[PDB]
Design a protein around this nucleic acid. Sequence first.
RNA 1: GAAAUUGUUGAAAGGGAAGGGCAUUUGAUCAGACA
RNA 2: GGAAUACUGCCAGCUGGGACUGAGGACUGCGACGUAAGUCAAGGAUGCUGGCAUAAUGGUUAUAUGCCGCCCGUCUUGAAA
RNA 3: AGAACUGGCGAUGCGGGAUGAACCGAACGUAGAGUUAAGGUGCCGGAAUACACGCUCAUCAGACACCACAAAAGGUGUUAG
RNA 4: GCCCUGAAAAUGGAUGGCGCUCAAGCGUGUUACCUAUACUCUACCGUCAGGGUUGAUAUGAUGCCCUGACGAGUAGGCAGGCGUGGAGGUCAGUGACGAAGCCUAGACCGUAAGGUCGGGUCGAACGGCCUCUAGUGCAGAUCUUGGUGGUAGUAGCAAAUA
RNA 5: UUUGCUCCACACAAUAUAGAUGGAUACGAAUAAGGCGUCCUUGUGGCGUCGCUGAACCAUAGCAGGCUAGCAACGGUGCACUUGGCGGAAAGGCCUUGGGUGCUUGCUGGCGAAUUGCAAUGUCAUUUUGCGUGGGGAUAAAUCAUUUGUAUACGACUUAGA
Lengths: 127, 92, 197, 171, 69, 97, 106
Amino acid sequence: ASLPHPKIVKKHTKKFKRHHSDRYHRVAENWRKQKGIDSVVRRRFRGNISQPKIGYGSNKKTKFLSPSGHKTFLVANVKDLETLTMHTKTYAAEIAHNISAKNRVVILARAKALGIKVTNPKGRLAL
Amino acid sequence: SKNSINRPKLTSNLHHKVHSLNKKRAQRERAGLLKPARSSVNSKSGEIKSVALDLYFQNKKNSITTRTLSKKRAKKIERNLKYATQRKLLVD
Amino acid sequence: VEPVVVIDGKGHLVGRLASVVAKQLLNGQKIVVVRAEELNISGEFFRNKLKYHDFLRKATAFNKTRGPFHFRAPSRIFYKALRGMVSHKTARGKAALERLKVFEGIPPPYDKKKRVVVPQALRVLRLKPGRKYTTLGKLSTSVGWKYEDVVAKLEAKRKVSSAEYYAKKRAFTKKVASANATAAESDVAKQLAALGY
Amino acid sequence: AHFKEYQVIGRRLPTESVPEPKLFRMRIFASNEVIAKSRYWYFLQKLHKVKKASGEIVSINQINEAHPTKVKNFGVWVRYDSRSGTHNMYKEIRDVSRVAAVETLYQDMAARHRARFRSIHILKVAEIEKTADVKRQYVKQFLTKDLKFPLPHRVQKSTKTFSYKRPSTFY
Amino acid sequence: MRVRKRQSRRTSTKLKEGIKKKASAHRKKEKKMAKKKKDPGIPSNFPYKAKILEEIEAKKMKDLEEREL
Amino acid sequence: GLRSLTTVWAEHLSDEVKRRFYKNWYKSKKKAFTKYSAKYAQDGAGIERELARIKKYASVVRVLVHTQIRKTPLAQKKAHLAEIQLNGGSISEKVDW
Amino acid sequence: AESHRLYVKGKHLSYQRSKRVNNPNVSLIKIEGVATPQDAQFYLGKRIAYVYRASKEVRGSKIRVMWGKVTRTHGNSGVVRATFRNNLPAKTFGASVRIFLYPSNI
RNA sequence: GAAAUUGUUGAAAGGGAAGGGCAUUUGAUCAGACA
RNA sequence: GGAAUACUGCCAGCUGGGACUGAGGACUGCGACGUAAGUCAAGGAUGCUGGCAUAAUGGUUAUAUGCCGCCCGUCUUGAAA
RNA sequence: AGAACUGGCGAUGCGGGAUGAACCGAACGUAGAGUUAAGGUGCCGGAAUACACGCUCAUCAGACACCACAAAAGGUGUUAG
RNA sequence: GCCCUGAAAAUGGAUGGCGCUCAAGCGUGUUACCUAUACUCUACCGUCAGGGUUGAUAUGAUGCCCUGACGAGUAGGCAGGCGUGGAGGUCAGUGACGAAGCCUAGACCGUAAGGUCGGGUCGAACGGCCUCUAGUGCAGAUCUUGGUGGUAGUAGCAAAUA
RNA sequence: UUUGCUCCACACAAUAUAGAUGGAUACGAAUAAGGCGUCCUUGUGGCGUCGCUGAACCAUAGCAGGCUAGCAACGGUGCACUUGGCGGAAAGGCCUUGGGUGCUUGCUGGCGAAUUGCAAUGUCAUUUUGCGUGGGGAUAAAUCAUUUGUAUACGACUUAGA
């Protein structure tokens, strides 16, 4: 269960790779605006990669919701988790990557007690 | 082709390819190299995937060695499991 | 509607038949063209022989073994006319062309199969009377194809056998026509007549 | 398009120095009212210096055939401006209505003398009252007694791509 | 026999646009040069010639009957 | 084009031809025409069938000959086999010859 | 009987396309026996199946079906435009589809 | 103990490029939820 | 002499078929039908039902197919090379 | 060739002209549906081997721009005047 | 008017190709039909503009709500952000039950800069937020230093008798 | 070769779709002409009739087609046999003899069908390979190495060797 929302539509599901990120290892896939005066990518020719522009902005009513319908919140300890006690249908706590296993089981205990959804409960747990 | 215009060539190759492709796929599926169904008891959907953990429990249950468990990680898993068993011991 | 359409080539115009067949193939239909040597082209014989020689000039200058290949048989002239009407350099075009078979004469098993005509490519219904035309077998023989006499011989043989077949079938349909006319006045026959049958 | 025949009646705008100016009428063939009325103004420009802004249209009325089911021999009188000068022509058109005869003549001018609808001037169209007065053999060949002709080599239009019979050009 | 080369009918872009330039130049030169009827026409094969002739000859009176009071 | 319709061989073939059918004659069991000589045993019904087929359908008859290469000074023992076309006489006469 | 068919045979012709741009979201289906656009108005709304087989025995069956519907006519020769929930692969240009009689207006 | 680069294994493609865009087939893989 | 029909135009005439969309989220408005309470198609979709409940939909991914697809950058805007 | 003005390109994609600085079309966020422009509808290729009136047969037709050139003429080709 | 001739060489090729001849050519008429990032309608994004909002039993007034129109872009202008080393403050932040780093067709958020999580590896430190500061972000410069390929098991190892 | 290989009778694994789902349903020739039926004096004959499309023709009813009772005909049709003839263009098909067993919707009866829950292709071919299931038939070569020189840069070629 989550706070009600419409369908989560993503106007561009594919990642915006950089122009020649495939041709060269030295060119990363991190997006970069092509600044060349004769860049067919910048001039927006037919048959080239799409570039980010504000038209692809997600719906404001849905912009930060995960597929479960929650906005993700990073928690590192029980104290951080309890800030979502009154916001349980609008937020789901995600446990930070560096929280140790014992502190993670403490977090899961408190989260289940408060009913807060935890995004990655499987975590470092190898019971 | 241009020498044998009355034989299908592309279509014959595509039929042969689809036959050999799913014969190979079925051979792989019967040997069980493919992962089981999501509803299977042997599947790991929704649960963490770890080469090290799988090898540790395969050595405890008692080969493939491209997937190898280091003695370092084996000791770490044993220590973590001791902690987890102590936690279940304080639970019960 | 048929699974394979065996088109009789005789009396058909090369381009118009080629276009019809090409659109049939691209639509998923299997076409066989038989008697490619009695297929027709518009224009006098000399004009089409000249156009073929114009095609026959073309050859890779540095290595003639990789130039245009000038296939002489009427099936291959029709096939060339048809391959230009299909994007044959793709997998779709190659797949569609492999739904086509073209032959000189009528070899088995199609001699025992029904042959159709494409009226929108039939010279009779298309090409205005009095206008000259070219029969493809003459053109192929004139520009190199060396099996016209063979196909003529085998076609004469096939016509003899098929004439025997048709004589038998006409005898049998005479018998069946007599039978259906002898039952043509019964109660059930009149009932079928009331229903347009 | 498919033609209609109009009368278009106009006059110059009245003045203190002239009330009720002369009324001028032309029979005009056009697809619709607007083309016909412009046609009127163009011809009235050429005939004498009457500007469209200086005059008006007092009427416009479609003219129909008195007997639109009686085949007539039409004698049509045409001047035009194609392709290198100006000409007179006279064409016989055996036809039923004046508008059909005019449309046939416009098609003939487009076909042979390569002239557009704006290049063709219909001067007079007349039903030849007497068949002895027809002058063109291509029309006078249908006037003969007990006329019969076959339609040899019938081509049957086929709605099917394939046929299972060799077609026949009979009757 | 030995059919010769046939000229291409595939026009070039360069040739075609050059023709456009030539045609525009020809229009302008024709206007510059240009800056430096004998038929009423009642046709001799129209059948009703005499009738329309007589009708319009009767209409030559109006051009001189009325103009003077 | 022309097409080989059928081929009928003699009952007994020498070693010189049989050598032509092996790359490794000395190693072989020399089984060259062992299942084919039997077609002459059953009163030659298959042999007669293919000869009648040649008579019925063939428009060109070619005989198969070979050289008695042992008669030459050559060291080669593998004889040379060829098709020689028969001219003259009708098809039936060619086959009977 | 020996005929059990409740569908009209069709053919997948091409996507909706220009000379140099196609559009996979709309597909062109040629229905057998339909030769004019006014004949094709019958089949608008009917469900189309592209029934194709595979090798995995997925969900109790080795035969897979793509579902779609007839949306409008196309041209003057009886071609109709159809849209599927998953657009038909381009390898099926020339593949037989099935146009069922439901939903009915008869 | 990165990348370039390489070996082996598994999968796959390949009829004189490779790569990239949109869409979908197919194969492999994979996340989430309880009137 | 009497019509009819075509053509054009109009109807705040009736009635079917198909497709896409369902934004918004108590009420407030203008209306309509009503004898009235009320009801309504009137300031944006609801009702009833079935199947599955997982790799089925979906994503990632390898590909295959259809169509598109200078090779980036600099400098030259003129072959714009 | 000079002057004067106005448009186009520069900085600019997209549809069409097979192709493309100078042509035709076209108010560039992300999509869906409909309708179109210019160009087209035998096949390649989405779309009538549509209807209709004529003309034309070219022993290398034409599909093409045209007060453009070769272009003024030559022809027992055909058609209308 | 259409047709033919009305000159023009040199690799084999071009109405774009096939091909077309009562056309699939030419002139014209009538329609139907195909199709753009254009037009109409709707949704979503952003900008701009016009209204409304201290009302508290409610939070954030550069916030919220309603309404409409718009959206190309080099130089350049303005604005909002993402990332990195070090500093002041704070979370009595994370960490040997594993910090950082690295690898990963495993996941999620963002239009994007990027951010988050899972697994493997690792073994001792490192983050969020408010600020401060700068040796702060690379695809190029025949860039610098280092490393590594194809070429390629290729050229070659043939002068001076063996 | 634990009898490898091949050809015959079943049970299922793996199945495969450039795209099965009633039937590719056979004169030739002409098109300013022909098809069919009939007759004689057998013709380029006479007479009649037909097209103007296959919108045809054949099939077509049954649990995806069950279990049974009869009537009427002796027809049609399936299957495995078998008789003879024809087909070499790529014949791999066509026709025919006889018995055997089914079916028959040509006609009349009796019982079953449900719940797949209002649709989801709702799977109905063969396509083959094979672990096997029980009866048959079959008992070689090629290459390297050696050699030859009719050949040869090396491969290759041409010979010889139980």
